[PDB]
Structure 1
Amino acid sequence: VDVIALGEPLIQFNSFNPGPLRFVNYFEKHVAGSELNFCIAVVRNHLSCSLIARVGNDEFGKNIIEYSRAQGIDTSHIKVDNESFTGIYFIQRGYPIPMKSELVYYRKGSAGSRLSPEDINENYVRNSRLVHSTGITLAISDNAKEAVIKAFELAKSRSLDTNIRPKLWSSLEKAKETILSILKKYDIEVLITDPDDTKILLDVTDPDEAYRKYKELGVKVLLYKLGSKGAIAYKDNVKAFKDAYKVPVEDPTGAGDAMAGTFVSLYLQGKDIEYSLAHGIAASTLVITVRGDNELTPTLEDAERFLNEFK
């Protein structure tokens, strides 16, 4: 496989309409989770991609496997764990901030949080081009963190999305120490991050200065996500910026994962960072127009149509 990702796939329940969850009567089910969304983007851009994860021995774990198979993700290393349940979350949409979403997790002690070094096979990982994980996987348990540290030991090249979700950590100081340890121990081929995470990790906001400090930490390429203001990619002395597009927002959840998987998979195929960035932006624009996170992540050719035709 070209790309191996480590994480916890989840079931997402989205309210049918905006508003506090206590007034929501209906919920639509989607398959999501940060690294799963990312894998969908990698496979849409025509690389093979394997998710290493656990699911519970239950309907929702089967849902995750079948969905992933349907979408062309290698599912051989999604292990069923009879010892716990498949994690899920709910999205509260547009309240109290319109066009934004808030996640309510039911995932503590889930089968996905039991991901562990035992699941990481030396030979398997060495025969891939790139290993990806995120700060979510580093947060969910000590053994998921140690799975990432092992997989990153064995990898030929690594990507990391900082993705700090404060609800998943005991403190921001714990998040910071955990993530910086990773950056200090390993070279990172593509780091994906944003102003909020970078303020916690480096205490800087300016993207030019963020790249200078991340580069010191061993990062080669930085994808710096600015949301409604676009995104910036850095590599060596190239800086590429691409503005966001205006579209009606249904749910922005997972937009960042679509952008990151698209960017990384194109970068891996030898596309330059300007092309990979513009495609990451096309992908993150399409997925926000619907409740689900990854159904609208474009293939390479569809993102090229979007880029040539939409304004």
Structure 2
Amino acid sequence: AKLITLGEILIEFNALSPGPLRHVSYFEKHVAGSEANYCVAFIKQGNECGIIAKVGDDEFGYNAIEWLRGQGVDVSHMKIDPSAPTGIFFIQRHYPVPLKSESIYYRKGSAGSKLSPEDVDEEYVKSADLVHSSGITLAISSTAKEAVYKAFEIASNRSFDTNIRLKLWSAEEAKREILKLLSKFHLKFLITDTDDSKIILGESDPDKAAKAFSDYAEIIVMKLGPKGAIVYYDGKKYYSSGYQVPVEDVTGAGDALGGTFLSLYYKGFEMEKALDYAIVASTLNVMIRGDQENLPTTKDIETFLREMK
């Protein structure tokens, strides 16, 4: 299968030590951004992927292209805006909450945020089995939001990560926009969590929220963080629990869940097995800085699973 994703790629500056940023002296660079992550997770399971995105005529942008290309992502459909810098973020790890991570953005008016419909090729999208985006991409700009609308009307199959970031728009904003998005545009996949449901429908509880989402999506994945995840499908529910593992950095783990789950689905795996394998991509992510350098491979996941009894 072919997955196409659209959204803003980001250069990440990962705090080399935990604690408040004002006391961190070193930052380690990684290529990230949810949709970029989804891509790599997807390819790593044996499939094919592209990204529609804009980066700057800057080292950071050219860094994003080389990195993705190496990973094997089709990038020929990306754009280089010369009037805008690539958007970047900084991760503060384990402070003020242990085990947790916080992102500090420099992306307003980024080249990523200038992703517009004119960048979305009609013939190209029409070739993907799956067109995927997220609440981040809705949030960043109205050009980008329209971009997601264009690629969704063209689509045939759609997947969405609600992926609400309150630093990017009010609970309020996020609610109507996601709700709006789901009026038109029925979804093949819908990836979310307890929190986004608390926003979108004010409904903290998993199976409830899932029943409220399921007129708009065939499959729902509840990310549950440390405790794992739940897949809802065919009027059935399967919970797949967590593993206990050193936590270096939580950022990227949601994507590792999603990208991997989508890809193994398209490799034929029964839903229980797909979520299960993806839970291991998630567990592996948690234990390094970098959203993408720990993403495993169907062989790697299997290894992980065999030696865990």
- 1:95 has 2:89 as partner: no
CA contact (8 A) 1:278 1:307 kept: no
C-alpha distance in structure 2 between counterparts of 1:310 and 1:168, whole Å = 39
The equivalent residue for 1:9 is: 9
CA contact (8 A) 1:234 1:273 kept: no
The equivalent residue for 1:130 is: 130
C-alpha distance in structure 2 between counterparts of 1:291 and 1:133, whole Å = 24
Q: Which residue identity lines up with residue 232 of structure 2 in the other structure?
A: Y
C-alpha distance in structure 1 between counterparts of 2:220 and 2:17, whole Å = 36
Q: CA deviation digits over 1:196-220, x for unaligned, max 9? A: 001111121222211211112x200
The equivalent residue for 1:189 is: 188
Q: Percent identity?
A: 57
- 1:248 has 2:249 as partner: no
The equivalent residue for 2:287 is: 289
Deviation at 1:237, TM superposition (A): 2.5
Q: Which residue identity lines up with residue 211 of structure 2 in the other structure?
A: R
- Which runs of structure 2 are paired with 1:113-262 in the superposition (5 Å)? 113-169=113-169, 171-216=170-215, 218-262=216-260
C-alpha distance in structure 2 between counterparts of 1:266 and 1:183, whole Å = 25
C-alpha distance in structure 2 between counterparts of 1:212 and 1:184, whole Å = 16
C-alpha distance in structure 1 between counterparts of 2:40 and 2:207, whole Å = 30
Deviation at 1:268, TM superposition (A): 2.0
Deviation at 1:127, TM superposition (A): 1.2
Q: Which residue identity lines up with residue 61 of structure 1 in the other structure?
A: G
C-alpha distance in structure 2 between counterparts of 1:309 and 1:189, whole Å = 34
Deviation at 1:279, TM superposition (A): 1.1
The equivalent residue for 2:275 is: 277
Regions of 4+ moved over 2 Å: none
Q: CA deviation digits over 1:83-104, x for unaligned, max 9? A: 1001101001111111211110
Q: Helix, strand or coil: the match of 2:203?
A: coil
C-alpha distance in structure 2 between counterparts of 1:137 and 1:156, whole Å = 19
In the alignment, structure 2 segments of 5+ residues that lack a partner are none
CA contact (8 A) 1:283 1:298 kept: yes
C-alpha distance in structure 2 between counterparts of 1:302 and 1:44, whole Å = 10
Scaled by the length of structure 1, what TM-score is found?
0.97
C-alpha distance in structure 2 between counterparts of 1:256 and 1:268, whole Å = 19
C-alpha distance in structure 1 between counterparts of 2:83 and 2:271, whole Å = 43
Q: Which residue identity lines up with residue 209 of structure 2 in the other structure?
A: A
Q: How many residues align?
A: 309
The equivalent residue for 1:104 is: 104
C-alpha distance in structure 2 between counterparts of 1:49 and 1:240, whole Å = 27
C-alpha distance in structure 2 between counterparts of 1:280 and 1:181, whole Å = 29
Q: CA deviation digits over 1:168-191, x for unaligned, max 9? A: 11x211110001111121111110
In the alignment, structure 1 segments of 5+ residues that lack a partner are none
Deviation at 1:121, TM superposition (A): 1.1
Q: Which residue identity lines up with residue 215 of structure 1 in the other structure?
A: S
Deviation at 1:239, TM superposition (A): 1.4
Deviation at 1:306, TM superposition (A): 1.1
Q: CA deviation digits over 1:11-63, x for unaligned, max 9? A: 00011110111111111110001100110000101111001000000101000
Q: Helix, strand or coil: the match of 2:11?
A: strand
Q: Which residue identity lines up with residue 75 of structure 1 in the other structure?
A: V
Q: Which residue identity lines up with residue 295 of structure 1 in the other structure?
A: E
Q: Which residue identity lines up with residue 31 of structure 1 in the other structure?
A: V
Deviation at 1:75, TM superposition (A): 0.7
For the aligned residue pairs, the C-alpha RMSD in angstroms reads: 1.0
